[PDB]
RNA sequence: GCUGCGGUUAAAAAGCUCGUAGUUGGAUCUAGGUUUACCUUGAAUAAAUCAGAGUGCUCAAUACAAGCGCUUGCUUGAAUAGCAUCAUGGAAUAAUGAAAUUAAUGGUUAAGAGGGACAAACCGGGGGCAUUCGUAUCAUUACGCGAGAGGUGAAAUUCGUGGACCGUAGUGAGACGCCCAACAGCGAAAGCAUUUGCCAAGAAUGUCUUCAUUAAUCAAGAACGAAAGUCAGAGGUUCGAAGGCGAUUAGAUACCGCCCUAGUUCUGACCGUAAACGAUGCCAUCUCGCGAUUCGGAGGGUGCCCUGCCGAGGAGCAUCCGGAAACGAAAGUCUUUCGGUUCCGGGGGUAGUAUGGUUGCAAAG
RNA sequence: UUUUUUUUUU
């Protein structure tokens, strides 16, 4: 039974990136997936993507730029306080010079740098680098 | 795989406790019969009375007769076998002597080629065995 | 190949792809108006019909259910309704 | 150490396969595991076909044949040299040997 | 409440005659004191009168059956054989 | 078909068209189709068969698209809902048939296994319908009375 | 080992399935140009200790002091940091509720989730009950034969002129379904194979049919579960534990041969264990090429052939990555660890032993 | 056809 569309999507992206493919198809698309991909694109780790509509959950087609090392989900969505954000980033990200921790906060889905700028905690969604 | 849900704290904690008992160290330190089984009753040393002097054949490939002594502990009256270290030190130990006994070093396990001996002598007649061996002190 | 247009698949591949695994699902079935020699009444029928569809007036069997597409009675033709 | 990928049998999609009794030993061996040999021979050895023909009571008689399907357990097959051990690489070859 | 755990009807025998003998008697005692569906009126009203005699309380039919069961397996197979021969 | 108690990873299902509009050639009216559905319900057919007949003969691809409502909803509004939902009714009927078969053949261990699975499905479906208030809260599947209930 | 271990072979996947608690659960409602849960900020929150600011106790551990003028004096430090409750703001994520005189009157979609329906010269050693047939083994009858037959490495025990063994033709019993028969099929697993009839069930495929989250895994709980074994009743052909003989041997309580008892078979109950093995738990998802094979479908040619055809199986050889390696298209997508969930392991023994509990007629589980 | 053994340490 499927229980994490984001986990499936990120696994598919990772596999396609490893194989060196130029496009990847993501099944059950969702708002969370779209926001995650938007953050990745804004930081330049993927190209453009299209949301194919089929009167159902829909699909996505993402253009891979051959620049992403790993995009992983963190389950369960543990609550991250602004005080332990530093510990979580040090643990999960390869370096302090690159890589992003994606959180969902009351403001919205963003990366850990923007969350620290706005002094927001929240539940962790995943990370990419 | 282990549970990963956000509300599985009870399962994780209970499973950890259940499996800690399959750990030799944890079980040895929490079984409950430690005091009644350990001859020293959880102490480091114990005073006892020498009953006889015995010789223990060293394990293979070594060959020798280790000079041990049978002791009865005062605190509980349990019988143990203790090693008399150093050379010719069995002479200092007479029968019906009050000896201080300590562990052999491996926390209740045999040491070296001596089989089944887990204790050694530290003092005889309130005198240090090392002092007697070195000649610092003499038999009371 | 690494570079494949997942957005615009080749029409022949889309035809020779499973109905569910296409980019957007589309059934391989269709509705057909059937003409039977005789009464010459056009009758709409589902391609994969599992019921014996019967002429309203002339009471002649038009299709026979099968494992896949329904089998049309001999002498009856069909045309795909748009 | 696992010697063979098929574990010495030919059992796939199956739980249980009935056994056969070997030809020599009589041991029970699963039918997929037993070494099977279909043998078609002349009813009379090659050295006596001429004698039988020259003694034939008919102008033209077709000499019949013996058909035997033989099942061997691994032990009685190796001993009889119906099958032989192979190198590690040659073990994976599945084509029948030349006859 | 369940009065007896396992003895059931043979609880009348107390501790006598041996466990295995009482166990053997239990099956047949239950069977002979049970009520069976009549094949004529269709109601569960067949009761044993004497060994081999089964009377229906409703339709008043008397049938020759088993000693402790309304019908026996051998009689059933014989009936099946006769019916099969009749059909073919 | 899917897998509930069996190891079947089937991939055969209807693929509804992307088009949500009635075809131009489709001239049956939204009210006429409702009348046809009520007529078939009078005759005694259930929604699964009503839809099949409408698709095979009358050319109605999706009654939801044409009439704007699901067949069971139409029957409910017209006050023709059955006592038992269709799937529950069929499961109960299957259980009754398997039992009747086992009364005769008591060595059919496979039939015993199938009965166990069917009754487990019955109980789960009944729980769901009781949650949705489609069954009386005290409704319970009784082996003895199930035959009359489903007949 | 939550972060963060391992379970094919090193210890470790329950035989298999159903199932309550528990855990976990698809997508979807203002993008643009009522409740909770959670996060932020405050409030309430003894010292000593820990961290930490200041300060030449001669340094330090400490301590909480002290430093300046000039006398009648001034100024000081003894900081700051360190579940539940209340309040504030935030409205993503995750749960939860609303409707079966006017107004657009009020039902999200129909999951490459799940269930149910409908189709089929459908598919199958799937299951059950009856039934038909076949040689063979054994016994026995009739007829012929004439002295060996059987068995082994060689023999012997054994059978044989009361005429065996061998032939031909019958008769009877019980067991078993050869060849076809396969890297074939079905079943949850255990397992399943002579013909036919009946009974209920099911897979896959087809589907513009229906319901609409009904789902995954599952402590306790429950069904099934090879062989042997136990109880009762029938059968007792073959083979055959135990037993008895003949060999072999130093011995031979064995291997070999002969005669056999329980058993092997049927019916109704027990037991619940196997190297019950793929020594690999289940559900979902992604990653490679090739040509074969079983079932169904689509499109053509003449049951067969073709379609680099579509699904679903069961495999094999071109195999990224992985692995201690053997090897694995999963045992890969894991220090770049993190989809959900159940069970299990923690150096070797003692030991699956003792004791207690429970199940069983016992054996034992 | 038969074919059992090979003290301790190094």
Swiss-Prot record, chain B:
PROSITE patterns: RIBOSOMAL_S12. One of its GO terms (molecular function) is structural constituent of ribosome. One of its GO terms (biological process) is translation. The modification Hydroxyproline is found at residue 61. It is found in: Cytoplasm, Cytosol; Cytoplasm; Rough endoplasmic reticulum. Coiled coil: none annotated. Belongs to the universal ribosomal protein uS12 family. This is Small ribosomal subunit protein uS12. It comes from Caenorhabditis elegans. The gene is rps-23.
Curated annotation (Swiss-Prot), chain D:
One of its GO terms (molecular function) is mRNA binding. It is found in: Cytoplasm, Cytosol; Cytoplasm; Rough endoplasmic reticulum. Transmembrane segments: none annotated. GO terms for cellular component: cytoplasmic side of rough endoplasmic reticulum membrane; cytosolic small ribosomal subunit; ribosome. Keywords: Cytoplasm, Endoplasmic reticulum, Ribonucleoprotein, Ribosomal protein. The keyword Transmembrane does not apply. GO terms for biological process: cytoplasmic translation; determination of adult lifespan. Residues 86-96 have a biased composition (Basic and acidic residues). It comes from the Eukaryota. The keyword Endoplasmic reticulum applies. Belongs to the eukaryotic ribosomal protein eS26 family. Component of the 40S small ribosomal subunit. This is Small ribosomal subunit protein eS26.
From Swiss-Prot, chain E:
GO terms for cellular component: cytosolic large ribosomal subunit. Transmembrane segments: none annotated. Coiled coil: none annotated. A zinc finger (C4-type) spans 38-59. InterPro entries: Ribosomal_eL37/eL43, Ribosomal_eL43, Ribosomal_zn-bd. It comes from the Eukaryota. Belongs to the eukaryotic ribosomal protein eL43 family. This is Large ribosomal subunit protein eL43. It comes from Caenorhabditis elegans. The gene is rpl-37A.
Curated annotation (Swiss-Prot), chain F:
It is found in: Cytoplasm; Nucleus, Nucleolus. Its main location: cytoplasm. Keywords: Cytoplasm, Nucleus, Ribonucleoprotein, Ribosomal protein. InterPro entries: Ribosomal_uS15 (IPR000589), Ribosomal_uS15_arc_euk (IPR023029), Ribosomal_uS15_N (IPR012606), uS15_NS1_RNA-bd_sf (IPR009068). The keyword Ribosomal protein applies. GO terms for biological process: ribosomal small subunit biogenesis; translation. Pfam families: Ribosomal_S13_N, Ribosomal_S15. CDD domains: Ribosomal_S15p_S13e (cd00353). Gene3D superfamilies: 4.10.860.130, S15/NS1, RNA-binding. GO terms for molecular function: small ribosomal subunit rRNA binding; structural constituent of ribosome. Component of the small ribosomal subunit. The ribosome is a large ribonucleoprotein complex responsible for the synthesis of proteins in the cell. Part of the small subunit (SSU) processome, first precursor of the small eukaryotic ribosomal subunit. During the assembly of the SSU processome in the nucleolus, many ribosome biogenesis factors, an RNA chaperone and ribosomal proteins associate with the nascent pre-rRNA and work in concert to generate RNA folding, modifications, rearrangements and cleavage as well as targeted degradation of pre-ribosomal RNA by the RNA exosome. HAMAP family: Ribosomal_uS15_A. Component of the small ribosomal subunit. Part of the small subunit (SSU) processome, composed of more than 70 proteins and the RNA chaperone small nucleolar RNA (snoRNA) U3. This is Small ribosomal subunit protein uS15. The gene is rps-13.
């Amino acid at each position: 039974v499927r229980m994490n569309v984001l986990a499936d999507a990120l696994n598919a992206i990772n596999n396609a990136e490893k194989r060196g493919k130029r496009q990847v198809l993501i099944r059950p698309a969702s708002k969370v997936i779209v926001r995650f991909l938007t953050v990745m694109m804004k930081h330049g780790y993927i190209g453009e993507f299209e949301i194919v509509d089929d009167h159902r959950a829909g699909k996505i087609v993402v253009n891979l730029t051959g620049r992403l090392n790993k995009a992983s989900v963190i389950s369960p969505r543990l609550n991250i306080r602004l005080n332990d954000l530093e510990k979580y980033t040090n643990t999960l990200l390869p370096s302090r010079q690159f890589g992003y921790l994606i959180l969902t906060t009351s403001a919205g889905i963003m990366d850990h740098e923007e969350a620290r700028r706005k002094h927001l905690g929240g539940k962790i969604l995943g990370f990419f680098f | 795989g282990k549970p990963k849900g956000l509300c599985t704290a009870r399962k994780l904690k209970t499973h950890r406790q259940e499996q800690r008992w399959n750990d030799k160290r944890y079980k040895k330190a929490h079984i409950g019969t430690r005091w009644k089984s350990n001859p020293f009753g959880g102490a480091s040393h114990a005073k006892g009375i020498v009953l006889e002097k015995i010789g223990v054949e060293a394990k293979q490939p070594n060959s020798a007769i280790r000079k041990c002594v049978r002791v009865q502990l005062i605190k509980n009256g349990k019988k143990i076998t203790a090693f008399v270290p150093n050379d010719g030190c069995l002479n200092f130990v007479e029968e019906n002597d009050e000896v201080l006994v300590s562990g052999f070093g491996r926390s209740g396990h045999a040491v070296g080629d001596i089989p089944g001996v887990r204790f050694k002598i530290v003092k005889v007649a309130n005198t240090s065995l090392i002092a007697l061996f070195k000649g610092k002190k003499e038999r009371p | 190949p690494l570079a494949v247009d997942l957005l615009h698949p080749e029409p022949q591949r889309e035809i020779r792809c499973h109905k569910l695994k296409r980019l957007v699902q589309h059934p391989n079935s269709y509705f057909m108006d059937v003409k039977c020699s005789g009464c010459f009444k056009i009758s709409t029928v589902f391609s994969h019909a599992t019921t014996v569809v019967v002429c309203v007036g002339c009471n002649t069997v038009l299709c026979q259910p099968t494992r896949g597409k329904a089998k049309l009675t001999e002498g009856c033709s069909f045309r795909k309704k748009q | 150490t696992f010697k063979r990928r098929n574990h010495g049998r030919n059992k796939k999609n199956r739980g249980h396969v009935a056994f056969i009794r070997c030809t020599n030993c009589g041991r029970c061996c699963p039918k997929d595991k037993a070494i099977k040999k279909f043998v078609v021979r002349n009813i009379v050895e090659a050295a006596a076909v001429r004698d039988i023909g020259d003694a034939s009571a008919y102008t033209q008689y077709a000499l019949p044949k013996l058909y035997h399907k033989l099942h061997y357990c691994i032990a009685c097959a190796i001993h009889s040299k119906v099958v032989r051990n192979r190198s590690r690489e040659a073990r994976r070859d599945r084509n029948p040997p030349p006859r | 409440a369940k009065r007896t755990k396992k003895v059931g009807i043979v609880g009348k025998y107390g501790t006598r005659y041996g466990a295995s003998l009482r166990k053997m008697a239990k099956k047949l005692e239950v069977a002979q004191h049970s009520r069976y569906t009549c094949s004529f009126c269709g109601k569960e009203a067949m009761k044993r009168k004497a060994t081999g005699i089964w009377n229906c309380a409703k339709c008043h039919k008397v049938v020759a059956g088993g000693a402790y069961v309304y019908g026996t397996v051998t009689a059933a197979t014989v009936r099946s054989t006769i019916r099969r021969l009749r059909d073919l | 078909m899917g897998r509930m108690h069996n190891p079947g990873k089937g991939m055969a299902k209807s693929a509804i068209p992307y088009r949500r509009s009635v075809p131009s050639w489709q001239k049956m009216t939204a009210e006429e189709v409702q009348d046809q559905i009520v007529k078939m319900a009078k005759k005694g057919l259930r929604p699964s068969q009503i839809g099949v007949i409408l698709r095979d003969s009358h050319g109605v691809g999706q009654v939801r698209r044409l009439a704007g409502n699901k067949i069971f909803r139409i029957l409910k509004s017209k006050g023709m809902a059955p006592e038992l939902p269709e799937d529950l009714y069929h499961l109960v009927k299957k259980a009754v048939a398997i039992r009747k078969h086992l009364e005769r053949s008591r060595k059919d261990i496979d039939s015993k296994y199938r009965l166990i699975l069917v009754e487990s499905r019955i109980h789960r479906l009944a729980r769901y319908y009781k949650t949705k208030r489609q069954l009386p809260p005290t409704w319970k599947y009784e082996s003895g009375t199930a035959a009359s209930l489903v007949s």
